[PDB]
Amino acid sequence: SVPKELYLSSSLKDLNKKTEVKPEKISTKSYVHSALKIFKTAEECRLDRDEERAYVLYMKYVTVYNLIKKRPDFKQQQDYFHSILGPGNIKKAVEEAERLSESLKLRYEEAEVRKKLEEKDRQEEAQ
Fold first, then answer.
1. How is it modified after translation?
2. Would 20 be classed as within a structural domain?
3. Which of 34, 68, 82, 96 suits 4 as a labelling partner, its CA being 20 to 30 A distant?
4. Is 45 domain-assigned?
5. Domain-located, residue 127
6. Domain count along the chain
């Protein structure tokens, strides 16, 4: 009947900042906030034991950090931004990713050779 109450922004120009897909057109602080949400989720998945999703989330976080860290504003205010992030969560993100990737590497080979062993089982004579 009536449009939902404004909650999300104050201007059209502000809403547009959420429509960008190019890093060039995304503020350091946007990504930092996005990174937080990603990190929260990453943790929840690791504990749930979903290695694929957790891995991706940790990695994406790391990929974001490695993208933004080299910007002038981040450099000057890394104190500040590390506050917004979890200080030394970039550390845990890196370590969880290697932990996970080394797990995944093995499980993906496990699934491959099984798949290959599955077919062989089918592919026999039986007169």
1. Tyrosine-phosphorylated in its N-terminal half in an EGFR-dependent manner.
2. no
3. 34
4. yes
5. no
6. 1
